[PDB]
Design an enzyme around this catalytic site. Structure first.
Site, PDB file in Angstrom:
ATOM      1  N   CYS A 145     -22.853  10.486 -12.690  1.00  0.00           N
ATOM      2  CA  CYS A 145     -22.772  10.274 -11.248  1.00  0.00           C
ATOM      3  C   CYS A 145     -21.274  10.617 -10.816  1.00  0.00           C
ATOM      4  O   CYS A 145     -20.895  10.856  -9.641  1.00  0.00           O
ATOM      5  CB  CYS A 145     -23.163   8.728 -11.237  1.00  0.00           C
ATOM      6  SG  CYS A 145     -24.473   8.262 -11.780  1.00  0.00           S
ATOM      7  N   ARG A 179     -31.609  10.407  -9.168  1.00  0.00           N
ATOM      8  CA  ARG A 179     -30.656  11.149  -8.250  1.00  0.00           C
ATOM      9  C   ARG A 179     -31.134  11.614  -6.947  1.00  0.00           C
ATOM     10  O   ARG A 179     -31.930  13.231  -7.251  1.00  0.00           O
ATOM     11  CB  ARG A 179     -30.047  12.385  -9.131  1.00  0.00           C
ATOM     12  CG  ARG A 179     -29.214  11.753 -10.268  1.00  0.00           C
ATOM     13  CD  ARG A 179     -28.499  12.795 -10.936  1.00  0.00           C
ATOM     14  NE  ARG A 179     -27.888  12.106 -12.451  1.00  0.00           N
ATOM     15  CZ  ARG A 179     -26.948  11.275 -12.665  1.00  0.00           C
ATOM     16  NH1 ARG A 179     -26.164  10.975 -11.465  1.00  0.00           N
ATOM     17  NH2 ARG A 179     -26.739  10.683 -13.432  1.00  0.00           N
TER      18      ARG A 179
END
Lengths: 244, 244, 244, 244, 244, 244, 244, 244
Positions: free
Chosen positions: B49, B125
Site C-alpha cells: 500500500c 486493491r
C-alpha cells in the site's frame, strides 16, 4: 447493481462450450497445474475485440512459458467464433490459438458479473486471472470502448506466480518500483513479537518493521517482466494492417 | 459472491469521511468538472500500500494534467491515515496530497464491493475510474499481494478521455497497437445500410466494414499516452529507499 | 415447459435491434399496414438456417405481393448477421433483403417462447405470422434439425388474408381440398335460429347446416395459392450449389 | 400468454379418454415403437375440422407406413366424437380410423397450451409430432379459421425420421431444396479441430466447413417425400362433395 | 437500540486477531484458569484511549497478581495497534504489555454491542469482565469523551473473586460501605424456613433476616481493595507528560 | 443476548409509575433542565440494594448539586418500595429521597435491557446516566452480587458535564490522570489541515497532534471530583449498623 | 382479550418459585394425591389482599381436612412475601401458613391469564381449583376492588369432591337448593333408550327423564358444606382489628 | 387454551338473538343505566341448569332492586328456550322472566371464552358481571357438574355497586370480614406523599398507611348484603320438588 465472483474465491465451477469443445472450469486447467486468464469481449467481428485477440495471440507463447492458458468469452456462438478466427487468420495473418467460450444467452456472463450498464446485451472486457488451485487472483473490468494492455496481464500473472513461489508481496510498478526497484516485499509481521524478531534478525533491508524487502527474483524473472513492459511501451516498426 | 457498482452506472452517491474532511461523492468532483480515480488499499502501514501511495503521489501532476483527482480508501481511521502519511513524508520523502477515505466498519467498501474473499477484514486493491459526469468507466480489482501499475491507470483515463472527445474506440495496447499502431477505431456500423455507406465513403482506412480506423489523435496525445508506458517500462535511476 | 404469446393476442410490444436498425414490434409493421412473419433460427453460419434464409429470400417478392414483410431472429449479434448475409450473397449469389433481429441474451426469445428444450442456448425455428393489426395469427415451432417449407408459410398467409377478406374459413389443404376443392367455408351458425335460417336460405352448397361453402375467391387468389404448393412440389431446374 | 410443452421435452404424461378407450400418453405409442401425431381441432360438427379429419383419414396409411399414428383432440365428449365420425362416414363416405381425445374440461388442452386468445372455450388447431422415445419433435399452432396442410405434416415426420436414421439435418423445402435439392446436411462441426478435419477429409460436398451435405437418402424415401408435396399441389380429379 | 451479550451468559465464542496473534475467546483464558477484562476503545492514536492504555499498563501487575489477563479492542488494524504501542513506549515511556484485538469491519464489536449511536464507526469504551468459566460477570459502557477509572475495574474484579470464594455478596462501596464497612453480605434467605433458621442460628451480624453480614475477607484482601481506591483518589506527584 | 438503548440515543420515551407518582421519562427531567441517573436493583428488601440506596441517599445532595436527579427502578410494587423506604428510615436512620419506579411485569426493564442471564426474574444493577437533553451518556451493568461504587457515578457525571461545557474529553482516572493529571483533552483533529493548524498554533500542551490538552477546569470543580474519590477511598468513621 | 387455561385441561406444567421454595405444579400436589387451590392477588401490602390472606389462613384447616392445599400468587418477590407475612403475623395476629408464588415479570400470570385490563401491572384476584389429577375444575376472576368469599371456594371443592365420589352433579346453592335441597343430581341420560330405562327403573326421585336426583351424600358431608355458608353469613363476634 | 374477554374491558359489542328478541350487548343495558349478569349454561333441559335458572328467577326481584338485569346464554335455539321455560313454569311453578341468548353454532360462546375442555359442544357455567358503563367487572367459570351459588353473585354486584359509589374496596367476605367486619377499605395511597398525608388526615381507622378503612355503607346496605349470605346458608323450609 451487479454481483461478481471475488478475489480469493474458487472460480465458479461450470461446464462451458468453447470453439475447442466443452470444458469444465476451473478443473480443465487445475488438473494440468495451469493458471488461466479468462477474458471476455463484447462481440466477434468488432474491432477493439479483434485487436485484443491478435494481441493475446501474439503473446500466447509468453503465457504458455509461464504455465498460463488463455480462454476468451463472448455471447456469440462457436460458429461465429470460428468464422471470426478464420477472418482474422486470413486478413490479419494471425492464428488465434486459444479457445473462446460461446455463451449466447449470457449464462456464463451473469455468473461472472460481466454484463454491466453500458450494454444489456454484450459483456464488458473483463479479465479474471485464476491460479492453479482454481482461485481468482485478480479481476479487471475494461469497457467496450477501450482495449486492454495485454502486457499488464502478463505482468500480473508473472508477478503473482513469483510472489507465490517466493512467498513475497510485489510493490507497485514492479520490476520498476520507485522505492525498492525489483525488490520484493516480505509479508509484514502481524504480531508484536514477530515484528521484534524481524528487526532483531537483520535478515532484510527495511524501512520499518512492517516494511522489509529483499531481491530474491532471478535476473531472468525480472528481465522477463521488464520485457513485457518495454514491449507495451514500444511502437511496433511495421503494423499488421500494412502487412495486410 | 459480492455485489459491485457497474461500469456505465453513476457512482453510488454517498458522503464519506476522508482525512481531508467529509466529501460527497461523486458530486464533489462532478461540480468541479473533474474526473476522479477512487482506489482502495488493505491497510495503512503495510508495504505494497505504501509503495502504491508513493507511486500515485509521484504521478499526481500527471492526473492533474488530465483533470482527474485521486481519492484513496481503506478501513483504517483518519487518525491512522494522517500518521501513515506523516511517516511516508518523513521516511520516504514524499507527501501524499490527496485524500484517503476512512471507513472503519466497511460501509463504503461494501457499497463498492471492495471486501473480497481474500480477507474478511481489509479491502482488496480496487480502482474505480469515474468521469466528470459521475459515471464509472472502468473498475480494476488487484489483490493484496500485488501493487498496481499506476501508469496503466493514467493510460486508461487518457484513452477514455480521447475516445470520448474524438468519438473513437481505442485498440488494444494503444498507442502501440500491433494492427493499427496509434490509430483509433470508428465504432462499427450496426446496420447493413450503415455498413455499406461507410465502405462507400472511403473516408477511413479499413480492414472490413466493421473495422475502420483513422488517426485523429494529436501527436501530443499519443505521445503523452506512450509516455506513461515508457515510464512504466523504465527502471528507476535511483531508488527512494537508498536516499531515505 | 415454456410460456408463449398466443394466437388472437396482440404481438408483445418490444423494441428489438435488427441488422437494419432498432424497430418497435409490432408497431413498425402495423404502422405500415403490413402483416409480418417473424421467424427464428438457431444460429448464423449454420446450414439448415442458411437454406431457410435463401428460401425466404427467393420468395420475398411473393411475401411482398401479399402485403407481408419478413423478419428473422436468432441469438447472434448484428455483426454476425451482416457477415452471414455477406457470405450468402458471395457464395450462394442470393441477397437476404429483410432484417434479422439480434437477441444475444435471449430476451426476445424468452418472450416469444423460442427457447425450447432441444438447446438451452439457441432458439428453435419458430414462425409467428402477425396481421396488420399486430395480432398473432399462427405460430409454428420446427426443431433445429428440420428446415421449414416456406411455401406453406405463403399459403398460410394468403389463406388467412383471403378468409379475413371474404369472411370464410379455409378448408384443409386449400385450394386443393378433397371435399370442396377451392371452395371456402361459411363460419357455422352458432344458434338454433341461425342454423335454421341458413338451411331455409338455400344460398350455399351445403352438406349440413353447419357445413356450407361457396367459391368466392377469385381465380387469381386460387392459382396464386396453388402455385406456392406447385413450387414446393417441384424439383429445382438447376441447384444453387452448382453455380456456387 | 400461455404455457406450452417444449420441443425436446418428453410429451406430458397423462391418461386420456379417447373414443377408442382410455390410454396413457405418450406411453401407449412409445410402447409400440410408434411416433404419433397428436392434433387438436376446435369442435366436432365444425367444417374446417371435418375437412381436416377427412384429409388425415385419407393419408392415414401413409402415416402407418412411416411407423406413425394419429390421435385427435377436442373439448367435445366421446359421444359427440362417435356421432361426428358417423356423420362423416355417412355423408362424405370416409371412415375416420384413428382415435380422438375427448377433453370436456380443457385439462389436456391446458397441459398442451391449446386454448389461445382466439376462443376461451375451444382449442386452436395444434399439432404435436412426438417420436418413439415420447419426445416432442415439432409443434404447429394453426388458428381456427385455417385448415392445415396435411401433406406437410407427413413431410415433416418422414424428414424427421430420415434425418434421425441418417444422422442428417434436413434443408428448407427438402426434398426440393433450392441449393442442394434432395441432399441432406451433415450437422456442423462445433470445434475448430472438427471443422479442419471435416474439410481435410474432403468426404462431403461442401460450401464451407459448416455447410456440408451428401445424398444418403434412398431414391424411394426421396420419391415418397416428393409425392406428399405433389399430392398437396395437385387439385383432386373429383371432389367428395360431388358423390356425397 | 442494539444487541449485547448479557451478564451471566458465556462470553461469545470467537477466534479474534490480536497484535499478539489469533486467539480464541473465553477459551484462551479459560484454559489457563484466568479471568480476563476485555475493554474497547474507539481509535488508536486518540488521546483518551492512550491514557486508558497507559493506566491499564501501569496496573498490569495488579491485574496479573489477581490472575486476571487484559485484552484490548478497537476497529483499527494490527499494524496501527503495533505502531501505536511503539508510539506510547517511545513518547510516554510505558510499554503496553497486553494484546489488542484488531476488528476492522466491526465484527467483534457488533457481537459485543460495542457500536453505539455516538459513532457509527468507532466503538464506545466498553468493558467486559469475564470469569475463569468464561462467564460475563460485569459490563460497563463508557462513552468516547470520558476515560474509565481503572482502579474501579480492579475493585470490581477483586470483589467478584472474593465474593465467589467467600460465597458472599459485596455491599455498595466495599470495602468502605457506610453501613457495614468491609463487611460482606450473606445472600438473603429465599424461603420462610430459611429466614427463620437464619435468624435462629445467631450466627451473623444482622439488621433483619434478609440483611446479615460478617467479616470474612482477610485484612490483606481488604487492604488490597482499599489500595486501589486510595490510588484512584491520590493526585499522582510526577505526571508522565513532564517526565517524558 | 439482549437488546439495550445505546449511548448517544434519546432515552426511550415512556410513562412510568414511581412511589412519588407517574412520570414521563425523559421529559420529566429534561423539562426541568436536569440530568438524571436511573439505576435498577434486583429487589427491595435485599441487602446489597439496601446498601446501594443508602449510599445514593447519602450522596443525594452531591448529585443534586450537579443538576442530577436520581431515580430508582426494580420489579417490585410501589407498596414494597414505600415499606422498604420506611424500613430503611426506621432501622438505618436514613431517609431515601428520590423516587423508585415500580416495574412489576418488567416492561421498563426489558426496554432498558435490564434483564440479564443471571436472573430471569430480577434486574441486574444497571445505571443509565441521561443528560438534560434526554440523551444516554453512559451505561453500567453491575451484577446482583456486587454493589456499585456510587462515587464513580458522581465522577462520571461531573466529568461529563465538565467535558460538555469546556468542549473537552476527560482522560482516564481524571482528575488524577497519570499522564496529564487534572488536565483535559482537546478533541483530536480529524483532518490533515486541522492537525497542521493545531500543531502550528502552539496553543495547547501536546504530545502529538492528536494529543493536546490543557487545565481549563476550575480549582473547585477539580477538588469536587477529587472529593468523590477521596470519599470512596476513605473508611467511614462510624458504620451506620452501630448507631442503629 | 387474553388467553386462559380451561376447565377440563391439565393445569399448565410449570416450575414456580414460592416463598417456601421452588415447586413444580401441578405435580407437587398430584404426587401427594392432593387437590390445590391456586389464587392470585394484586400486590402484597395491599388491604383487600391482606384480608383474603387472613380469611384463607383462618380456614386453612378446613382446606386440609378436605385434602386441599392452598398456594397463592402475586407479581411481588419472595422477599415481599416473607416481610408481608411477618407484618400480618405481628399486626393481625395470624400466621399465613401456605406458600405464595413470587412472579415478578409475570410469567406465571400470563400463562394463567391473570393479567386483565384494570391493571397492566398487577394480577386480578383469580382462583383455580385443581383436582388431584392436576385437572382445572373451576376458575373465578374477581377484581382488584372486591375480596372473595372464601367459604364459597370451600363449598366448591367440597361439592366437587362429593360429586366426583358419588358420581353426581350438584344443584345450584347446594346443600340448600330450593328445588331438591341437599339432593344431588344424576347426570342426565343422553339417548332415548337410556332415558326410558332411567324412568322405568324407578330408582331416583325425578321431575322428568332428564331431571333425576337422590340424597346419597352423608349428613356429615351435607352439614359440613352448609357450615361453610353459615360461617360466611355469620357476623364475627370479635374483629381482629380491635385486639390488633 | 382459550381466549376470554377480561375484567376492566368493555363487554364485547355484539348483536345477540334472545328469546325476548334481538338485542345489542353491553348497549341495551348500558342505555338503561343498568348493570347486567350474563351467565351461560350448557343446555336447556339439563338439571343443574334448571336449578340455576330457578335460583336466578327467585332472586330476580333482588337483582332488579339493585338495577341489575339478568341474561342467560346457551347453544340451544330460542325455540328450545321458550319450550324449556314453559316446562319450568309448568312443572316447578316458577316463571323465568329474563332473556336467554340462543347461539347454536357457538359464535357468542367463543367470543366470551365459554367453550372449555370439559365440552367441545356446550358452554361451561360462565358468569359475567358487567357494569352500567358496559365494563366487565367479574367473571366466574363454574363447570358443568356444579351449579353456582346465586347469592354470591348478588353479593358481588351489591358490593361492587357500593364500592363504586362510596369510593371503597371491599374486604374478603364483607359485610363479615374478620378483620374489619362491614368496614370498607380506602384505596391504598400509591405515593409516599399520599401515604404520609393519609397518616396525618387522621380521617380513617388504620392498621398501617396502606390499610385504612371506614364504615360508610348504611345499615340497610350492609344488612341487604348480609341477607344474601343468610339466605344462601339457610335451608329452605319447603322444597319446590315437594309441591311439584
Amino acid at each position: 447493481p451487479g454481483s461478481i465472483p471475488l478475489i480469493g474465491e474458487r472460480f465458479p465451477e461450470m461446464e462451458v462450450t468453447t470453439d475447442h469443445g466443452v470444458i469444465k472450469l476451473p478443473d480443465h486447467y487445475v488438473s494440468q497445474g495451469k493458471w488461466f486468464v479468462l477474458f471476455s469481449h463484447p462481440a466477434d467481428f468488432t474491432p477493439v475485440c479483434t485487436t485484443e485477440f491478435v494481441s493475446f495471440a501474439r503473446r500466447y507463447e509468453d503465457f504458455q512459458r509461464l504455465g498460463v492458458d488463455l480462454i476468451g468469452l463472448s455471447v456469440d456462438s462457436v460458429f461465429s467464433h470460428i468464422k471470426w478466427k478464420e477472418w482474422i487468420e486470413r486478413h490479419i495473418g494471425v492464428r488465434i490459438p486459444f479457445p473462446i467460450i460461446a455463451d449466447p444467452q449470457g449464462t456464463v456472463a451473469r455468473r461472472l458479473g460481466l454484463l454491466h450498464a453500458e450494454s444489456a446485451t454484450h459483456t464488458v472486457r473483463g479479465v479474471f486471472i485464476v491460479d492453479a488451485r482454481g482461485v481468482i487472483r485478480t479481476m479487471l473490468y475494461y469497457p467496450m470502448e477501450l482495449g486492454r494492455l495485454v502486457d499488464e496481464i502478463l505482468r500480473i500473472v508473472k508477478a503473482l506466480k513469483l510472489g507465490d513461489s517466493l512467498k513475497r508481496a510485489v510493490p507497485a510498478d514492479w520490476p520498476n518500483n520507485e522505492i525498492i526497484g525489483e525488490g520484493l516485499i516480505v509479508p509484514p509481521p502481524t504480531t508484536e513479537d514477530q515484528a521484534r524478531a524481524r528487526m532483531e534478525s537483520g535478515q532484510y533491508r527495511s524501512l520499518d518493521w512492517w516494511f522489509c524487502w529483499d531481491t530474491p527474483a532471478s535476473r531472468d524473472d525480472v528481465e522477463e517482466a521488464r520485457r513485457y513492459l518495454r514491449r507495451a511501451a514500444e511502437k511496433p516498426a511495421k503494423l499488421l494492417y500494412e502487412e495486410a
